[PDB]
Amino acid sequence: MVEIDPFEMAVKQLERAAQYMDISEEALEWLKKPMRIVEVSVPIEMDDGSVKVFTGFRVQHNWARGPTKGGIRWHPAETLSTVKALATWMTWKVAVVDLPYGGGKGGIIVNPKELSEREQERLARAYIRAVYDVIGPWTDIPAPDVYTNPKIMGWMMDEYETIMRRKGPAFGVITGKPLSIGGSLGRGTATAQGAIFTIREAAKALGIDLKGKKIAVQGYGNAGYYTAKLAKEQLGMTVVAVSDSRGGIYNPDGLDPDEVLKWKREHGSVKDFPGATNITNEELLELEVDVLAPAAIEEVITEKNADNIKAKIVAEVANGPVTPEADDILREKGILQIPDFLCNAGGVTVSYFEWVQNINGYYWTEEEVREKLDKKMTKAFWEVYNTHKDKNIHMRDAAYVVAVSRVYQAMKDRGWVKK
Ligand SMILES: NC(=O)C1=CN([C@@H]2O[C@H](COP(=O)(O)OP(=O)(O)OC[C@H]3O[C@@H](n4cnc5c(N)ncnc54)[C@H](OP(=O)(O)O)[C@@H]3O)[C@@H](O)[C@H]2O)C=CC1
Ligand SMILES: O=C(O)CCC(=O)C(=O)O
Ligand SMILES: O=C(O)CCC(=O)C(=O)O
Ligand SMILES: [N+]
């Protein structure tokens, strides 16, 4: 259902942004192709006793800066191109906030809503058994993503530890784990906290007081719900509309995120929430708000609605929710955009913190994680902002100049590319 191919779009963005920097042709060709792709068959036993084979992908795009990092997406509409694009974005995501990581991603073409608990556990364990040879605490560190949660992360960690015979830091093979089995404090609200920090910095740059303003959030998952909650709590914002895959609810007077979450859990969706009006995702994206945070499937803003966006700041919590064309239209409209791999870099940052805690065997507190995350996100955002201001270019491009250059430097320090 995607407007354009995700990997093609990602490559187009990379070229469009490399047009504003000095990079050799060979380095560009290296960066336009994932470094390793592994397609595996994942066989599991269903509840009725039959054996079903799913398709799994583990794509690492580059590991010049360090071990690759990226979540695992469970999605019926997933394609290898989507995983390649996500790994490519992961690379820039970890480069922009200066982490010793490369870019990676994983996925399974499956509808998890049709799978039971035992089937989900079997699927996670079989995926680990399939991709064990390309993952590790120093090779490839998976994490939670769309339709995956810390539960599945703990199952995957247990399977990896069983295969690995407890020879090294198995806890560090995967992030977003439960706190009991080597989890990190603040990882649950990581991406939301990073998005909130970036929104606050953007408002500071734009000279806008966020108290009493309006935020519309698309998607009510681990990122969308926590983003709405933190915006209502920390920034003093008024959440006027939320949504999920079945539709959204809008309220001019504001919504309480906890009640909406309870209604969603007790009914399966946020639709027909009391005191709110049912709308579509297309209608929510077009609402008159001060901040719009897409936290759902990619490619939600295209030439079919780019001119209808009326938000002062668009916080791309999701991975690649805006097309380059739509980026040009929004920039022509004077709308500030927080780039996708900079806005939601808080999640990968706290995942890096969890990995450090796991490999060192020493765990931090909430305050330390909160301070380090704030420091990293503020530095990265201000670097990207000053970059886009000095060169008079789009935000997305500027972050690329901040990110790709670092990656480029790594290759020149490894001898991968001579020029
Ligand atoms: N997973 C993570 O920890 C983080 C994720 N990201 C990126 O952010 C995005 C969202 O992740 P996350 O918040 O965890 O998602 P979740 O796994 O928590 O849940 C998905 C939510 O988004 C909804 N959704 C999926 N597709 C659509 C759609 N087309 N339209 C409207 N709502 C939709 C789902 O609806 P419903 O509930 O009805 O099924 C659900 O509400 C992803 O692209 C991800 O890669 C980066 C930061 C960390
Ligand atoms: O935290 C991680 O390592 C994965 C995060 C992720 O999947 C993403 O940022 O898209
Ligand atoms: O991402 C989550 O928080 C849970 C994902 C989910 O709802 C699912 O696996 O069906
Ligand atoms: N992230």
CATH code for the domain of 151 = 3.40.50.10860
- Specify if 243 maps to a domain: yes
Q: Clarify whether 32 is annotated catalytic.
A: no
C-alpha gyration radius of the chain: 20
For residue 151, report the distance from its CA to the centre of ligand 4, in Å.
Answer: 18
Number of domains composing the chain: 2
Q: Is residue 225 annotated as involved in ligand binding?
A: yes
Provide the b/e sequence for 290-316 (b: ≥16 CB within 10 Å).
bbbbbbbbbbbbbeeebeebebbbbbb
Q: Are residues 84 and 171 located together in one domain of the fold?
A: yes
Q: Are residues 142 and 89 located together in one domain of the fold?
A: yes
Nearest CA to ligand 1 atom 31: 245
Q: Are residues 143 and 256 located together in one domain of the fold?
A: no
Residue after which a domain boundary falls, among 136, 166, 181: 181
**Gap between the Cα atoms of 147 and 234, Å rounded:** 27
Which residues neighbour 415 within 8 Å (Cβ) at sequence distance 6 or greater? none
For residue 370, report the distance from its CA to the centre of ligand 3, in Å.
Answer: 25
Q: Are residues 141 and 210 located together in one domain of the fold?
A: no
Resolution of this entry in Å?
A: 2.8
Among the options 69, 93, 105, 264, which is catalytic?
105
- Specify if 341 maps to a domain: yes
- Specify if 20 maps to a domain: no
For residue 225, report the distance from its CA to the centre of ligand 1, in Å.
Answer: 10
Ligand 1 and 245: CB distance under 6 A: yes
**Which structural domain range is residue 359 located in?**
182-418
51-62 and 102-108 as β-strands: parallel, antiparallel, unpaired? antiparallel
Nearest CA to ligand 3 atom 7: 147
CATH code for the domain of 389 = 3.40.50.720
Residue after which a domain boundary falls, among 131, 165, 181: 181
Closest CA to 394 of 316, 319, 277, 299: 316
Closest CA to 289 of 214, 208, 211: 214
- Specify if 9 maps to a domain: no
Ligand 3 and 234: CB distance under 6 A: no
- Specify if 333 maps to a domain: yes
Element (H, E) at 125: helix 117-131
Ligand 1 and 111: CB distance under 6 A: no
Residue after which a domain boundary falls, among 131, 153, 181: 181
Q: Are residues 176 and 323 located together in one domain of the fold?
A: no
Q: Are 338 and 398 in contact (CB under 8 A)?
A: no
